[PDB]
Design a binder for this molecule. Structure first.
Ligand code: COA
Length: 273
C-alpha cells in the first residue's frame, strides 16, 4: 500500500514538480499527482474529474477587475474576501514554491494582483503578488510569485514594477515584506538597480534621494543600499544624490540591448481606496 506525496502537478500542458510541501486538503494515495485547472486553479485527483469540470462554462482569466491592460499583459485586482475559493487555490499553488506562507485559508486580509499574458489563445496566468489591505509596516507586497513554467522570462520584474506603480498612485513609498526568499531578494535588487540606472540616463545625471523615492516609491533604505552597491552615492549641492558614470551608461545600454517589456504607468486605471 503506497502512500505517496504530491510530487507533480499537471497544469495545462505542464507537469511541474513542487519545490516545497503545500497543504492541499487531499487524500494520500498510490498516485503522486493532481490536476490544477489553469483558470480556476481548482485541484483534482483524477484526470476524469478534471475533465468533467473543465467542460463547465467559466471565464478565461482571473476573477477580478482588470485595472491594467497593454498589448503584452493584463493585471487583475482581486479582493480575497470576494473570491475566497479562487484565492485559497492560488495560495495553495503558491506555497508549492515557497518555503513558508501564511495560512492559505485566510485570504480576506489580502488583495491579489494577478498578471496574465494574452495570446491568440486568450489569457494565461503567469504570476501574481499579494498585498495586505492594511500593513502596519507599509509593505507594498506580501508574497510574489512567477509560476515555475514561466520563470526567467522577465515576468517577475514586471510584477515588481507594477507593485511600485500602485504605491506611486497611492502617494506612498513601499517595500516588499521581510524576510524575502533569496530568489525574491535577488529579483528586487536587480529591479532596484535597473530602476536607478534607467533614471540616471533618462531623467537626470544627478538625482537626490527625495527625488528618487518620489519618482519610484522606493524607500530611502532600499535606495541607499542599491546606490552603495553600484557605488553611485555622493554629496552634491548640500544633499545626498546618486550620479551617472560610464559604468552606469554601460549597464543601461546592456539593459536596453535586452529590449525587455516594461509597465506603462499611463495604462494603470486605478484609484486607491
Ligand atoms: C522571485 C521570482 C518572482 C522572480 O520571478 P521571474 O519571473 O523568474 O523574474 P525575472 O524573470 O524578471 O528575473 C530576471 C531573470 O530572468 C532572466 N530572463 C528574463 N527574460 C529572459 C529571456 N527572454 N531570455 C533569457 N533570460 C531571461 C534574466 O536574465 C534574469 O536572470 P538573473 O536574475 O540571473 O540576472 C520567482 O523566482 C519566484 O516566483 N520564485 C518562487 C517564489 C518566491 O520565492 N517568491 C518571492 C518570495 S520573497
Amino acid at each position: 500500500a503506497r502512500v505517496r506525496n504530491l510530487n507533480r502537478i499537471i497544469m495545462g500542458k505542464y507537469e511541474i514538480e513542487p519545490w516545497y510541501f503545500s497543504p492541499y486538503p487531499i487524500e494520500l494515495t498510490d498516485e503522486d499527482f493532481i490536476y490544477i485547472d489553469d483558470f480556476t486553479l481548482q485541484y483534482f485527483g483524477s484526470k476524469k474529474q478534471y475533465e468533467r469540470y473543465r467542460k463547465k462554462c467559466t471565464l478565461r482569466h482571473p476573477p477580478g477587475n482588470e485595472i491594467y491592460r497593454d498589448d503584452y499583459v493584463s493585471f487583475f485586482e482581486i479582493d480575497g474576501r470576494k473570491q475566497r475559493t479562487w484565492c485559497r487555490n492560488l495560495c495553495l499553488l503558491s506555497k508549492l514554491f515557497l518555503d513558508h506562507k501564511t495560512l492559505y485559508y485566510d485570504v480576506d486580509p489580502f488583495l491579489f494582483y494577478c498578471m496574465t499574458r494574452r495570446d491568440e489563445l486568450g489569457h494565461h496566468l503567469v504570476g501574481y503578488f499579494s498585498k495586505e489591505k492594511e500593513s502596519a509596516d507599509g509593505y507594498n507586497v506580501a508574497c510574489i510569485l512567477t509560476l515555475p513554467q514561466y520563470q526567467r522570462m522577465g515576468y517577475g520584474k514586471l510584477l515588481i514594477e507594477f507593485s511600485y506603480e500602485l504605491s506611486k498612485k497611492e502617494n506612498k513609498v513601499g517595500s516588499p515584506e521581510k524576510p524575502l526568499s533569496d530568489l525574491g531578494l535577488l529579483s528586487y535588487r536587480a529591479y532596484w538597480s535597473d530602476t536607478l540606472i534607467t533614471l540616471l540616463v533618462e531623467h537626470q545625471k544627478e538625482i537626490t534621494i527625495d527625488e528618487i523615492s518620489s519618482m519610484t516609491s522606493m524607500t530611502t533604505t532600499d535606495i541607499l543600499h542599491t546606490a552603495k552597491t553600484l557605488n553611485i552615492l555622493r554629496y552634491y549641492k548640500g544633499q545626498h544624490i546618486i550620479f551617472l558614470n560610464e559604468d552606469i551608461l554601460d549597464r543601461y545600454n546592456r539593459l536596453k540591448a535586452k529590449k525587455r517589456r516594461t509597465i506603462d504607468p499611463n495604462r494603470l486605471i486605478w484609484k486607491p481606496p
